[PDB]
Amino acid sequence: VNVGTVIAVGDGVARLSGLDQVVASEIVEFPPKAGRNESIYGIALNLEQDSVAAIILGDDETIEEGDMVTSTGRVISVPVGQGLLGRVVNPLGQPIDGKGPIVYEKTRPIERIAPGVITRKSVDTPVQTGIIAIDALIPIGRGQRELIIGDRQTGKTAVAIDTILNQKGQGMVCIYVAIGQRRAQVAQVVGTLERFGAMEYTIVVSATASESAALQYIAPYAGCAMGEEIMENGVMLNGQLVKDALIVYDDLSKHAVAYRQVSLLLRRPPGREAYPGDVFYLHSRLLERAARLNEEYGGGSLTALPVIETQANDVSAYIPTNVISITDGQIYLESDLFNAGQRPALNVGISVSRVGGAAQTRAMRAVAGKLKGELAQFRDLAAFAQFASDLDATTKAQIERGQRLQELLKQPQYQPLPVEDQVAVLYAATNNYLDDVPVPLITKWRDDFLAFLRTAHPEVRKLIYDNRLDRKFPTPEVKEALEAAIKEFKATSNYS
Amino acid sequence: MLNGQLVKDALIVYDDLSKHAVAYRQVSLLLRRPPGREAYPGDVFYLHSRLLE
Amino acid sequence: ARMVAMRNATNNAKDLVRDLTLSFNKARQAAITKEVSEIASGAAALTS
Amino acid sequence: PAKGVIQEIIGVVIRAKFPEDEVPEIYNAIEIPLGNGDRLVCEVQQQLGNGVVKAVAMGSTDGLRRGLEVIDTGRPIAVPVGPATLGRVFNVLGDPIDGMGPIGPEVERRPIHRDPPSFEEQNTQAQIFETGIKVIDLIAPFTRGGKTAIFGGAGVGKTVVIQELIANIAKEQSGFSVFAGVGERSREGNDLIHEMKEARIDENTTVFDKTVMVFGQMNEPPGARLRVGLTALTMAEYFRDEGRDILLFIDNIFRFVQAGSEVSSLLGRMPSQVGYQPTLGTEMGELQERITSTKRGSITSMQAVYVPADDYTDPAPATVFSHLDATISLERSIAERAIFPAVDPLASTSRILDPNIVGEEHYRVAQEVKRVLQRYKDLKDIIAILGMEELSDEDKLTVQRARKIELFFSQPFTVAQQFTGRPGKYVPVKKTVESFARLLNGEGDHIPESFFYMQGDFDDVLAAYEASQ
Ligand SMILES: Nc1ncnc2c1ncn2[C@@H]1O[C@H](COP(=O)(O)OP(=O)(O)OP(=O)(O)O)[C@@H](O)[C@H]1O
Ligand SMILES: Nc1ncnc2c1ncn2[C@@H]1O[C@H](COP(=O)(O)OP(=O)(O)O)[C@@H](O)[C@H]1O
Ligand SMILES: [Mg+2]
Ligand SMILES: [Mg+2]
């Protein structure tokens, strides 16, 4: 009764007559035949009378009318647990890195309702991305859905990869679900993760643009099922049980495009911009599973970093506004700032963080309130930066200091900074200690200063990190130590 | 009869014929009649004119 | 003064032309999408 | 009773066959046993033929097969109503989801599908409802017992305005409040709204202690979002019918509409306009007409309406627009300019903006503010390319006043202290009117524009300007 036959193969959908006792989201098998050694699966979704339409998770040219199909008896699920760490996997959980089969004991079902509405707690623990601008102005807490929205080639994937790289000893399990990305891009990402040793806590779910339409639609849900397994139960990382996960849905706009073509090949009525009427439900049910559970339900969390690609900086399109209305805050990456040398092209004017401001280290917020205020002053004075010294009532000094902070926010790729280094640099900048440094040599200064903290005075960094959770950060001990370190660096070194 | 005189003059105000057309479009689509422009039925001009003539 | 003011006005007009061209491209794409969606709805409701 | 069998499962729509003499009614509720002792309560929508009905899942419906039995309950979805529903958080079906125990059988259960109040029951009495927000209390004043809505895009402050309204008015209600989180995203709702409603104390009783909360959040399938608004309205109608005043906050009515659209797409209806249901107007009327205040009791409704992309011509907000006593429009352009109470004064109207209802000076000030802003909007194209210098002296003064007015509408909120590092500010309607009258009279012309940003009344602006000196 669990065996059916394909009676039609179409645009990624096969009709599968005679497959009774199938539940509404089974993973049918299509057992192998001559010319196809490996089974390719499908999701039975339209369980109409005497016909079970199923979308094919793979190439649809391999199956034929009259093919025999078996019912696995389970809703579509992905293997989850400790064995997924360090593996690049198919959205079905099958390995594609050639390192061997995935070892696992449980499969978590994708496509499930979020943990709940009672079952949540406000974010309190920060996610240290390692970017000065993001960690200072756009704080991200564990359990926060922070969209990364920008144009093409604006550093969104670079921001996500830096965030993943910074979670080395932070007790975080990172997942990178690249949806619709080129296989060359995913290979470069995985090579970068292996280069810095991040893969020992990182899972990669790859759904290449060449892959099927049914894939790239279950890829974010497979990754989110893995992240929910990390959230609910936790895994043994660095010898300790971690229940904190950080997932990056790379290019959810391509996910929306893949779901749109899946819906349209299923002859569903299009909505706005030819997308199906439930694309908002798609992304909402995907992202709602990224939560911060209270201590009654485990206390774990799943941070989400969705990525949205815009066209000509159009924030007000359909999918970008859908994801903005779903996610908590936005990290907007300007193309103009990206091409002007501000490589972490954070649009401070419009990038926000609805939550996570309370989920910030008190050191970072204490030294970043002044930074945000003076960046706001610099943006206000940007329109007035066209006068030949016609304004000088500390306005020239404010413009110079805003340019100084803007140059400080400029950060090279693949170099995340620890929280102590970030707060030390921000305190040095916000306490009028870089004002004698010329604009082009600030970044080098920062680097040199960090080296001076790494080699000469590690105890200053340790003291800074120890009292980062104090209600008032600049306690006289750490205040004196950091003042002495900054003055000593300004003495023994040059202006830069 | 009105105020002691036989009034034969009337002033009718259809406060929303856009909503009337929306209601008729809902009727036609639930009857599975073929749509026209903006999903309105073909006889939606014949509707209002029949009312307004 | 007239030369400088008209140069600034020309630059602002070019920026406005760029923004209006972006808006027009969005409007044209939306119009064609609406047209093809309406045609597909009117065709699929009577054939299959 | 009336046990039938599942025939088809398309999305959340389940087609089930029943015996000829025991077909369920149109809005009847039918339970799938689903195993494990917990049912799936589908709601019928259509009758197709010889015992064949179509129902909406109101749940996951992701792991159930064809041929499963379906038990007809014989009655529509019934939710508890009464004082037992105060201080509780409910589902679409009326089942509590908080840690508290289940609602007892002695509590009256009412169907979620009831007729709206008739024409004789309607109450047209209108008076000012002070909110403490300058742009809301001046341009589009709230009506006590009247329907007001806050339209907006995605990143604009809709939830922040809802939260500020709750923080301002829910401590003094003389009644009860009901919050329908239809597609509310469950982070800014029960994770935050319920936490802040248990922290606000009213005479040793929290606001949450006199608040019903019903949450059809975004994670839910379309059926739960499609009927959760009606569930909350059924719970509020009990307190309305017994005379108690009701403060009703429904967040993102557009989520209700979108759920209806997805269900209609799965139900095989022919779509209208941009993929919307043919029955959009009737569904909007069914939900919105039950919100109206009557002679027995009053409901002061404050809905939020999402605008897809930024298209205010979308059928869902357009259908919402005509069901309101006060309209507030939130614009992305104003929000990106850091005027975070980003209400567009030219696109926001109110019915009680009448000199007889709200006052002669209030009406005069609001109309002059709107006239100045309309003149600014007309001269925007002149200012964009020629600049300010080409305008006449009166036009220059009008544009300067309009810019100061645009900055002055921004107001720091108590719930927005994390974004702006300023304390929350409450401005009475009289102070708002007096401050804007003083701004229009000529006072503040010497003050630079930046001192009108995120302030209270005009005295705060004067104090800041004197402090800067
Ligand atoms: N902080 C940075 N410093 C230096 N280079 C950077 C930085 N961020 C990004 N880049 C560079 O910008 C380029 C594009 O970055 P990236 O691939 O992350 O962007 P994207 O928005 O994901 O692009 P795509 O549309 O191709 O997916 C790369 O050459 C990368 O090295
Ligand atoms: N009154 C306000 N003061 C400061 N910031 C605000 C205010 N209102 C909205 N915001 C900004 O808007 C964001 C919240 O938007 P929200 O209302 O949640 O969007 P939605 O319309 O989807 O509910 C916050 O990140 C905040 O920065
Ligand atoms: Mg990329
Ligand atoms: Mg909201």
Closest-CA distance, C38 to chain B, in angstroms, reads 7
Among residues D324, D320, D326, D322, the alpha carbon closest in space to that of D357 is found at D326
A250, A205 contact by CB (below 8 A): no
Tell me if D156 CB under 6 Å of ligand 2. Answer: yes
DSSP notation for D207-232: SGGGEEEE---TTS-HHHHHHHHHHH
Catalytic residue among A268, A354, A379, A454: A354
DSSP notation for A166-232: H-SSS--EEEEEEES--HHHHHHHHHHHHHTTGGGGEEEEEE-TTS-SSTTTSHHHHHHHHHHHHHH
Tally C-beta pairs within 8 A across A and C: 12
Place of tokens 């003389």: D174
D152, D253 contact by CB (below 8 A): no
D231, D97 contact by CB (below 8 A): no
What is the C-alpha separation between A53 and A43, in angstroms, rounded?
A: 8
What is the C-alpha separation between D80 and D111, in angstroms, rounded?
A: 9
What residues contact residue A362 under an 8 Å CB cut-off, 6+ apart? A468, A469, A470, A471, A472, A473
What is the C-alpha separation between D220 and D194, in angstroms, rounded?
A: 19
Torsion, CA D333, CA D338, CA D341, CA D343, rounded to 10: -20
Q: Six-digit token pair at D195?
A: 């936490």
**A244 - beta bridge partners?**
A301
What residues contact residue A100 under an 8 Å CB cut-off, 6+ apart? none
DSSP notation for D286-346: HHHGGGS-BSS--EEEEEEEE-STT-TTSHHHHHHHTT-SEEEEB-HHHHHTT-SS-B-TT
| Residue D12 CB coordination number (10 Å) | 26
Q: Please state, in angstroms and as integers, the Cα–Cα distance from residue D449 to each residue in A148, A382, D121, D390, D461, following that order.
A: 33, 15, 49, 20, 10
Q: Does D393 touch chain C (CB under 8 A)?
A: no
Sign of the Cα torsion A347, A352, A356, A361 reads positive
Helical ranges in D170-272 per DSSP H = 193-197, 222-241, 253-266
Helical ranges in D386-457 per DSSP H = 393-408, 429-441
| Phi, psi angle pair for A82, to nearest 5° | -70, -30
Query: Residues 161..220 of A with a Cβ closer than 8 Å to D: which?
Result: none
DSSP-derived secondary structure letter, D121: T
What is the C-alpha separation between A59 and A41, in angstroms, rounded?
A: 10
Among residues A478, A285, A274, A462, the alpha carbon closest in space to that of A367 is found at A478
Q: At CA D167, angle to CA D165 and CA D172, rounded to 5?
A: 90
Q: Six-digit token pair at D64?
A: 């159930």
What is the C-alpha separation between D347 and A316, in angstroms, rounded?
A: 19
Using the mean position of ligand 3's atoms as its centre, give its distance from the Cα of residue A408 in Å: 24
Nearest CA residue ID for atom 2, ligand 1: A413
Chain C: residues touching B (Cβ < 8 Å) = 38, 41-42, 45-46
Torsion, CA A40, CA A46, CA A47, CA A50, rounded to 10: -90
Among residues D73, D68, D115, D67, the alpha carbon closest in space to that of D93 is found at D73
The reply to whether A150 sits in an annotated binding site is yes
The reply to whether A153 sits in an annotated binding site is yes
Q: Does D389 touch chain C (CB under 8 A)?
A: yes
3 state SS of A101: coil
Q: Six-digit token pair at A10?
A: 């179409």
Instruction: Using DSSP bridges, classify how beta strands A51-56 and D245-251 pair: parallel, antiparallel or unpaired.
Output: unpaired
Instruction: Using DSSP bridges, classify how beta strands A301-304 and A307-309 pair: parallel, antiparallel or unpaired.
Output: unpaired
Nearest CA residue ID for atom 21, ligand 2: D158
Q: Six-digit token pair at A267?
A: 């002859």
Of B16, B23, B38, nearest to D273 by CB-CB distance is B38
Q: Which ligand is nearest to the CA of A328?
A: 2
Closest-CA distance, D417 to chain B, in angstroms, reads 44
Of A269, A270, A312, nearest to C22 by CB-CB distance is A312
A222, A110 contact by CB (below 8 A): yes
A27, A76 contact by CB (below 8 A): yes
Among residues D448, D265, D33, the alpha carbon closest in space to that of A276 is found at D265
What is the C-alpha separation between B46 and A469, in angstroms, rounded?
A: 74
What is the C-alpha separation between A458 and A453, in angstroms, rounded?
A: 6
What is the C-alpha separation between D389 and D395, in angstroms, rounded?
A: 10
A40, A6 contact by CB (below 8 A): no
User: What single letter denotes the amino acid at residue D451?
Assistant: F
- C-contacting chains (≥3 CB pairs under 8 Å): A, B, D
Query: Residues 233..272 of D with a Cβ closer than 8 Å to C: which?
Result: 270-271
Neighbours of ion ligand 4 (CB under 5 A): D 158-159
Closest-CA distance, D263 to chain A, in angstroms, reads 9
What is the C-alpha separation between A70 and A47, in angstroms, rounded?
A: 15
A450, A429 contact by CB (below 8 A): no
Top mutation candidate among D133, D160, D331 for ligand 2, by most atoms within 8 Å of CB: D160
Top mutation candidate among D134, D192, D193, D340 for ligand 2, by most atoms within 8 Å of CB: D340
DSSP notation for A406-449: HHHH---TT----HHHHHHHHHHHHTT-STTS-GGGHHHHHHHH
Using the mean position of ligand 3's atoms as its centre, give its distance from the Cα of residue A251 in Å: 7
Residue of chain C minimizing CA distance to B29? C45
Among residues A197, A198, A181, A284, the alpha carbon closest in space to that of A246 is found at A198
Using the mean position of ligand 4's atoms as its centre, give its distance from the Cα of residue D158 in Å: 5
What is the C-alpha separation between D281 and D271, in angstroms, rounded?
A: 13
Q: Please state, in angstroms and as integers, the Cα–Cα distance from residue D238 to each residue in A277, D211, D241, following that order.
A: 34, 13, 5
**D147 - beta bridge partners?**
D301
